[PDB]
PDB file of all heavy atoms in Angstrom:
ATOM      1  N   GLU A  17      10.074 -19.638 -17.506  1.00  0.00           N
ATOM      2  CA  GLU A  17      11.021 -19.528 -16.294  1.00  0.00           C
ATOM      3  C   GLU A  17      10.252 -19.112 -15.030  1.00  0.00           C
ATOM      4  O   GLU A  17      10.973 -18.986 -13.933  1.00  0.00           O
ATOM      5  CB  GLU A  17      12.023 -18.371 -16.633  1.00  0.00           C
ATOM      6  CG  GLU A  17      12.867 -18.717 -17.864  1.00  0.00           C
ATOM      7  CD  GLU A  17      12.294 -18.458 -19.252  1.00  0.00           C
ATOM      8  OE1 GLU A  17      11.210 -17.930 -19.426  1.00  0.00           O
ATOM      9  OE2 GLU A  17      12.974 -18.898 -20.212  1.00  0.00           O
ATOM     10  N   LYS A  18       8.994 -18.819 -15.087  1.00  0.00           N
ATOM     11  CA  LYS A  18       8.146 -18.270 -14.010  1.00  0.00           C
ATOM     12  C   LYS A  18       8.815 -17.025 -13.438  1.00  0.00           C
ATOM     13  O   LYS A  18       8.850 -16.764 -12.222  1.00  0.00           O
ATOM     14  CB  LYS A  18       8.051 -19.343 -12.887  1.00  0.00           C
ATOM     15  CG  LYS A  18       7.608 -20.762 -13.339  1.00  0.00           C
ATOM     16  CD  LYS A  18       6.288 -20.686 -14.040  1.00  0.00           C
ATOM     17  CE  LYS A  18       5.774 -22.089 -14.535  1.00  0.00           C
ATOM     18  NZ  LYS A  18       6.632 -22.541 -15.621  1.00  0.00           N
ATOM     19  N   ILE A  19       9.213 -16.145 -14.366  1.00  0.00           N
ATOM     20  CA  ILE A  19       9.766 -14.873 -14.055  1.00  0.00           C
ATOM     21  C   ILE A  19       8.660 -13.834 -14.354  1.00  0.00           C
ATOM     22  O   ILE A  19       8.168 -13.758 -15.483  1.00  0.00           O
ATOM     23  CB  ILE A  19      11.042 -14.458 -14.832  1.00  0.00           C
ATOM     24  CG1 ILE A  19      12.170 -15.437 -14.442  1.00  0.00           C
ATOM     25  CG2 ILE A  19      11.387 -12.977 -14.604  1.00  0.00           C
ATOM     26  CD1 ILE A  19      13.344 -15.339 -15.307  1.00  0.00           C
ATOM     27  N   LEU A  20       8.334 -12.984 -13.307  1.00  0.00           N
ATOM     28  CA  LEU A  20       7.400 -11.909 -13.508  1.00  0.00           C
ATOM     29  C   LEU A  20       8.131 -10.573 -13.487  1.00  0.00           C
ATOM     30  O   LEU A  20       8.732 -10.273 -12.460  1.00  0.00           O
ATOM     31  CB  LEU A  20       6.328 -11.924 -12.402  1.00  0.00           C
ATOM     32  CG  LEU A  20       5.374 -10.782 -12.463  1.00  0.00           C
ATOM     33  CD1 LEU A  20       4.529 -10.875 -13.730  1.00  0.00           C
ATOM     34  CD2 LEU A  20       4.482 -10.778 -11.216  1.00  0.00           C
ATOM     35  N   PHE A  21       8.152  -9.878 -14.616  1.00  0.00           N
ATOM     36  CA  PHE A  21       8.700  -8.479 -14.681  1.00  0.00           C
ATOM     37  C   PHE A  21       7.667  -7.562 -14.209  1.00  0.00           C
ATOM     38  O   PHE A  21       6.604  -7.358 -14.871  1.00  0.00           O
ATOM     39  CB  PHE A  21       9.206  -8.074 -16.022  1.00  0.00           C
ATOM     40  CG  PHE A  21       9.861  -6.693 -16.024  1.00  0.00           C
ATOM     41  CD1 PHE A  21      11.055  -6.576 -15.466  1.00  0.00           C
ATOM     42  CD2 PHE A  21       9.144  -5.559 -16.462  1.00  0.00           C
ATOM     43  CE1 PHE A  21      11.705  -5.299 -15.355  1.00  0.00           C
ATOM     44  CE2 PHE A  21       9.701  -4.328 -16.363  1.00  0.00           C
ATOM     45  CZ  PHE A  21      10.979  -4.183 -15.788  1.00  0.00           C
ATOM     46  N   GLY A  22       7.812  -7.053 -12.982  1.00  0.00           N
ATOM     47  CA  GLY A  22       6.830  -6.156 -12.354  1.00  0.00           C
ATOM     48  C   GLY A  22       6.978  -4.709 -12.762  1.00  0.00           C
ATOM     49  O   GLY A  22       5.995  -3.957 -12.814  1.00  0.00           O
ATOM     50  N   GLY A  23       8.148  -4.302 -13.191  1.00  0.00           N
ATOM     51  CA  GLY A  23       8.426  -2.899 -13.498  1.00  0.00           C
ATOM     52  C   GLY A  23       8.145  -1.990 -12.343  1.00  0.00           C
ATOM     53  O   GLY A  23       8.152  -2.450 -11.136  1.00  0.00           O
ATOM     54  N   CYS A  24       7.854  -0.791 -12.585  1.00  0.00           N
ATOM     55  CA  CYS A  24       7.672   0.201 -11.477  1.00  0.00           C
ATOM     56  C   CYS A  24       6.402   0.034 -10.660  1.00  0.00           C
ATOM     57  O   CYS A  24       6.235   0.624  -9.628  1.00  0.00           O
ATOM     58  CB  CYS A  24       7.927   1.626 -11.903  1.00  0.00           C
ATOM     59  SG  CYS A  24       9.647   1.770 -12.414  1.00  0.00           S
ATOM     60  N   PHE A  25       5.488  -0.808 -11.116  1.00  0.00           N
ATOM     61  CA  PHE A  25       4.316  -1.263 -10.358  1.00  0.00           C
ATOM     62  C   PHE A  25       4.671  -2.077  -9.156  1.00  0.00           C
ATOM     63  O   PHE A  25       3.821  -2.233  -8.220  1.00  0.00           O
ATOM     64  CB  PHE A  25       3.450  -2.147 -11.291  1.00  0.00           C
ATOM     65  CG  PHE A  25       2.173  -2.685 -10.787  1.00  0.00           C
ATOM     66  CD1 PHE A  25       1.057  -1.821 -10.662  1.00  0.00           C
ATOM     67  CD2 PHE A  25       1.999  -4.050 -10.626  1.00  0.00           C
ATOM     68  CE1 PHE A  25      -0.173  -2.314 -10.198  1.00  0.00           C
ATOM     69  CE2 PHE A  25       0.830  -4.501 -10.129  1.00  0.00           C
ATOM     70  CZ  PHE A  25      -0.262  -3.703  -9.937  1.00  0.00           C
ATOM     71  N   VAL A  26       5.864  -2.733  -9.175  1.00  0.00           N
ATOM     72  CA  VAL A  26       6.369  -3.557  -8.026  1.00  0.00           C
ATOM     73  C   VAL A  26       7.532  -2.887  -7.315  1.00  0.00           C
ATOM     74  O   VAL A  26       8.560  -2.528  -8.071  1.00  0.00           O
ATOM     75  CB  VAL A  26       6.646  -5.002  -8.418  1.00  0.00           C
ATOM     76  CG1 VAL A  26       7.146  -5.826  -7.271  1.00  0.00           C
ATOM     77  CG2 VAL A  26       5.446  -5.605  -9.110  1.00  0.00           C
ATOM     78  N   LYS A  27       7.506  -2.665  -6.059  1.00  0.00           N
ATOM     79  CA  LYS A  27       8.624  -2.151  -5.276  1.00  0.00           C
ATOM     80  C   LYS A  27       9.484  -3.304  -4.760  1.00  0.00           C
ATOM     81  O   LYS A  27       8.990  -4.428  -4.674  1.00  0.00           O
ATOM     82  CB  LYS A  27       8.094  -1.318  -4.074  1.00  0.00           C
ATOM     83  CG  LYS A  27       7.126  -0.202  -4.450  1.00  0.00           C
ATOM     84  CD  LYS A  27       7.628   0.773  -5.483  1.00  0.00           C
ATOM     85  CE  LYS A  27       8.746   1.657  -4.990  1.00  0.00           C
ATOM     86  NZ  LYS A  27       9.058   2.705  -5.976  1.00  0.00           N
ATOM     87  N   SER A  28      10.705  -2.991  -4.446  1.00  0.00           N
ATOM     88  CA  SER A  28      11.566  -4.007  -3.856  1.00  0.00           C
ATOM     89  C   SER A  28      11.154  -4.260  -2.361  1.00  0.00           C
ATOM     90  O   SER A  28      10.442  -3.441  -1.778  1.00  0.00           O
ATOM     91  CB  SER A  28      12.990  -3.608  -3.866  1.00  0.00           C
ATOM     92  OG  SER A  28      13.256  -2.578  -2.935  1.00  0.00           O
ATOM     93  N   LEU A  29      11.594  -5.400  -1.893  1.00  0.00           N
ATOM     94  CA  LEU A  29      11.225  -5.770  -0.549  1.00  0.00           C
ATOM     95  C   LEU A  29      11.653  -4.781   0.519  1.00  0.00           C
ATOM     96  O   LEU A  29      10.928  -4.534   1.561  1.00  0.00           O
ATOM     97  CB  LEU A  29      11.716  -7.193  -0.270  1.00  0.00           C
ATOM     98  CG  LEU A  29      11.130  -7.843   1.021  1.00  0.00           C
ATOM     99  CD1 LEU A  29       9.651  -7.956   0.870  1.00  0.00           C
ATOM    100  CD2 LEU A  29      11.759  -9.215   1.143  1.00  0.00           C
ATOM    101  N   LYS A  30      12.886  -4.190   0.333  1.00  0.00           N
ATOM    102  CA  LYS A  30      13.459  -3.269   1.314  1.00  0.00           C
ATOM    103  C   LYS A  30      12.878  -1.851   1.172  1.00  0.00           C
ATOM    104  O   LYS A  30      13.044  -1.042   2.159  1.00  0.00           O
ATOM    105  CB  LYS A  30      14.965  -3.235   1.185  1.00  0.00           C
ATOM    106  CG  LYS A  30      15.663  -4.550   1.551  1.00  0.00           C
ATOM    107  CD  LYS A  30      17.145  -4.453   1.460  1.00  0.00           C
ATOM    108  CE  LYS A  30      17.728  -5.659   2.185  1.00  0.00           C
ATOM    109  NZ  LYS A  30      19.269  -5.405   2.430  1.00  0.00           N
ATOM    110  N   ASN A  31      12.103  -1.605   0.133  1.00  0.00           N
ATOM    111  CA  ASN A  31      11.533  -0.269  -0.036  1.00  0.00           C
ATOM    112  C   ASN A  31      10.545   0.085   1.150  1.00  0.00           C
ATOM    113  O   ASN A  31       9.690  -0.770   1.499  1.00  0.00           O
ATOM    114  CB  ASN A  31      10.671  -0.050  -1.285  1.00  0.00           C
ATOM    115  CG  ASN A  31      11.484   0.373  -2.426  1.00  0.00           C
ATOM    116  OD1 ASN A  31      12.196  -0.397  -2.974  1.00  0.00           O
ATOM    117  ND2 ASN A  31      11.370   1.651  -2.837  1.00  0.00           N
ATOM    118  N   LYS A  32      10.646   1.248   1.723  1.00  0.00           N
ATOM    119  CA  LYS A  32       9.802   1.727   2.805  1.00  0.00           C
ATOM    120  C   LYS A  32       8.724   2.583   2.353  1.00  0.00           C
ATOM    121  O   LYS A  32       7.821   2.913   3.089  1.00  0.00           O
ATOM    122  CB  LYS A  32      10.663   2.433   3.885  1.00  0.00           C
ATOM    123  CG  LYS A  32      11.740   1.588   4.557  1.00  0.00           C
ATOM    124  CD  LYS A  32      11.106   0.362   5.293  1.00  0.00           C
ATOM    125  CE  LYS A  32      12.091  -0.399   6.089  1.00  0.00           C
ATOM    126  NZ  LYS A  32      13.133  -0.928   5.227  1.00  0.00           N
ATOM    127  N   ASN A  33       8.762   3.025   1.062  1.00  0.00           N
ATOM    128  CA  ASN A  33       7.675   3.881   0.491  1.00  0.00           C
ATOM    129  C   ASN A  33       7.477   3.542  -0.974  1.00  0.00           C
ATOM    130  O   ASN A  33       8.239   2.650  -1.505  1.00  0.00           O
ATOM    131  CB  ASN A  33       7.974   5.318   0.689  1.00  0.00           C
ATOM    132  CG  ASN A  33       9.263   5.776   0.030  1.00  0.00           C
ATOM    133  OD1 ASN A  33       9.478   5.627  -1.187  1.00  0.00           O
ATOM    134  ND2 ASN A  33      10.197   6.214   0.797  1.00  0.00           N
ATOM    135  N   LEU A  34       6.511   4.191  -1.581  1.00  0.00           N
ATOM    136  CA  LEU A  34       6.144   3.905  -3.012  1.00  0.00           C
ATOM    137  C   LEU A  34       7.028   4.618  -3.952  1.00  0.00           C
ATOM    138  O   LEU A  34       6.913   4.398  -5.171  1.00  0.00           O
ATOM    139  CB  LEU A  34       4.692   4.267  -3.217  1.00  0.00           C
ATOM    140  CG  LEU A  34       3.650   3.470  -2.457  1.00  0.00           C
ATOM    141  CD1 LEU A  34       2.293   4.088  -2.621  1.00  0.00           C
ATOM    142  CD2 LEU A  34       3.666   1.985  -2.966  1.00  0.00           C
ATOM    143  N   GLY A  35       7.990   5.456  -3.514  1.00  0.00           N
ATOM    144  CA  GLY A  35       8.758   6.227  -4.463  1.00  0.00           C
ATOM    145  C   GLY A  35       7.916   7.312  -5.127  1.00  0.00           C
ATOM    146  O   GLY A  35       7.056   7.945  -4.407  1.00  0.00           O
ATOM    147  N   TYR A  36       8.136   7.631  -6.346  1.00  0.00           N
ATOM    148  CA  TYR A  36       7.528   8.754  -7.028  1.00  0.00           C
ATOM    149  C   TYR A  36       6.012   8.498  -7.216  1.00  0.00           C
ATOM    150  O   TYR A  36       5.618   7.539  -7.995  1.00  0.00           O
ATOM    151  CB  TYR A  36       8.172   9.075  -8.356  1.00  0.00           C
ATOM    152  CG  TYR A  36       7.488  10.209  -9.078  1.00  0.00           C
ATOM    153  CD1 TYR A  36       7.440  11.458  -8.519  1.00  0.00           C
ATOM    154  CD2 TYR A  36       6.755   9.987 -10.205  1.00  0.00           C
ATOM    155  CE1 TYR A  36       6.813  12.569  -9.195  1.00  0.00           C
ATOM    156  CE2 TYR A  36       6.144  11.008 -10.902  1.00  0.00           C
ATOM    157  CZ  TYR A  36       6.244  12.285 -10.394  1.00  0.00           C
ATOM    158  OH  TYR A  36       5.533  13.338 -10.986  1.00  0.00           O
ATOM    159  N   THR A  37       5.185   9.288  -6.624  1.00  0.00           N
ATOM    160  CA  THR A  37       3.709   9.057  -6.712  1.00  0.00           C
ATOM    161  C   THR A  37       2.986  10.093  -7.474  1.00  0.00           C
ATOM    162  O   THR A  37       1.730  10.077  -7.504  1.00  0.00           O
ATOM    163  CB  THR A  37       3.066   8.801  -5.333  1.00  0.00           C
ATOM    164  OG1 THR A  37       3.355   9.974  -4.512  1.00  0.00           O
ATOM    165  CG2 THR A  37       3.622   7.549  -4.678  1.00  0.00           C
ATOM    166  N   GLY A  38       3.754  11.026  -8.169  1.00  0.00           N
ATOM    167  CA  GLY A  38       3.083  12.149  -8.883  1.00  0.00           C
ATOM    168  C   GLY A  38       2.126  11.672  -9.900  1.00  0.00           C
ATOM    169  O   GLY A  38       1.156  12.435 -10.195  1.00  0.00           O
ATOM    170  N   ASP A  39       2.273  10.549 -10.545  1.00  0.00           N
ATOM    171  CA  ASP A  39       1.440   9.993 -11.585  1.00  0.00           C
ATOM    172  C   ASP A  39       0.729   8.719 -11.123  1.00  0.00           C
ATOM    173  O   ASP A  39       0.033   8.103 -11.881  1.00  0.00           O
ATOM    174  CB  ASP A  39       2.212   9.693 -12.879  1.00  0.00           C
ATOM    175  CG  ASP A  39       2.765  10.966 -13.455  1.00  0.00           C
ATOM    176  OD1 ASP A  39       1.996  11.932 -13.546  1.00  0.00           O
ATOM    177  OD2 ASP A  39       3.955  10.950 -13.931  1.00  0.00           O
ATOM    178  N   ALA A  40       0.777   8.427  -9.793  1.00  0.00           N
ATOM    179  CA  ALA A  40       0.289   7.146  -9.213  1.00  0.00           C
ATOM    180  C   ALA A  40      -1.227   7.262  -8.892  1.00  0.00           C
ATOM    181  O   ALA A  40      -1.850   8.376  -8.710  1.00  0.00           O
ATOM    182  CB  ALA A  40       1.099   6.748  -7.984  1.00  0.00           C
ATOM    183  N   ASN A  41      -1.860   6.128  -8.790  1.00  0.00           N
ATOM    184  CA  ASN A  41      -3.232   5.902  -8.295  1.00  0.00           C
ATOM    185  C   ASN A  41      -3.117   5.008  -7.094  1.00  0.00           C
ATOM    186  O   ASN A  41      -3.162   3.812  -7.212  1.00  0.00           O
ATOM    187  CB  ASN A  41      -4.171   5.261  -9.395  1.00  0.00           C
ATOM    188  CG  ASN A  41      -5.576   5.320  -8.956  1.00  0.00           C
ATOM    189  OD1 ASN A  41      -5.879   5.221  -7.791  1.00  0.00           O
ATOM    190  ND2 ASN A  41      -6.447   5.442  -9.973  1.00  0.00           N
ATOM    191  N   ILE A  42      -2.879   5.692  -5.937  1.00  0.00           N
ATOM    192  CA  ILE A  42      -2.570   4.929  -4.736  1.00  0.00           C
ATOM    193  C   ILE A  42      -3.840   4.127  -4.278  1.00  0.00           C
ATOM    194  O   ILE A  42      -3.628   2.976  -3.770  1.00  0.00           O
ATOM    195  CB  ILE A  42      -2.090   5.911  -3.541  1.00  0.00           C
ATOM    196  CG1 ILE A  42      -0.686   6.380  -3.974  1.00  0.00           C
ATOM    197  CG2 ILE A  42      -2.016   5.183  -2.220  1.00  0.00           C
ATOM    198  CD1 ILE A  42      -0.150   7.498  -3.124  1.00  0.00           C
ATOM    199  N   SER A  43      -5.065   4.635  -4.450  1.00  0.00           N
ATOM    200  CA  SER A  43      -6.264   4.003  -4.103  1.00  0.00           C
ATOM    201  C   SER A  43      -6.438   2.670  -4.890  1.00  0.00           C
ATOM    202  O   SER A  43      -6.950   1.733  -4.331  1.00  0.00           O
ATOM    203  CB  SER A  43      -7.549   4.881  -4.300  1.00  0.00           C
ATOM    204  OG  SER A  43      -7.453   5.827  -3.309  1.00  0.00           O
ATOM    205  N   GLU A  44      -6.132   2.674  -6.152  1.00  0.00           N
ATOM    206  CA  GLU A  44      -6.333   1.535  -7.028  1.00  0.00           C
ATOM    207  C   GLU A  44      -5.162   0.504  -6.878  1.00  0.00           C
ATOM    208  O   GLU A  44      -5.444  -0.692  -7.133  1.00  0.00           O
ATOM    209  CB  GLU A  44      -6.459   1.920  -8.544  1.00  0.00           C
ATOM    210  CG  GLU A  44      -7.057   0.879  -9.453  1.00  0.00           C
ATOM    211  CD  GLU A  44      -8.485   0.469  -9.120  1.00  0.00           C
ATOM    212  OE1 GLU A  44      -9.171   1.126  -8.338  1.00  0.00           O
ATOM    213  OE2 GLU A  44      -8.845  -0.726  -9.557  1.00  0.00           O
TER     214      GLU A  44
END
């Protein structure tokens, strides 16, 4: 179907920030 499930690694288009970054690797 050419569907990619991004999960929380992918933000929505309207998102203005990364959301919860407590466990994130912003550099990577």
Side-chain angles (χ1 to χ4, degrees):
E17 299 82 6
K18 309 300 180 291
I19 295 169
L20 176 65
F21 185 74
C24 294
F25 182 72
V26 179
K27 306 305 292 187
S28 73
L29 192 61
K30 291 183 167 197
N31 271 76
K32 298 298 189 301
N33 59 59
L34 292 171
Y36 176 64
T37 59
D39 294 316
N41 192 326
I42 291 167
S43 290
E44 194 64 12

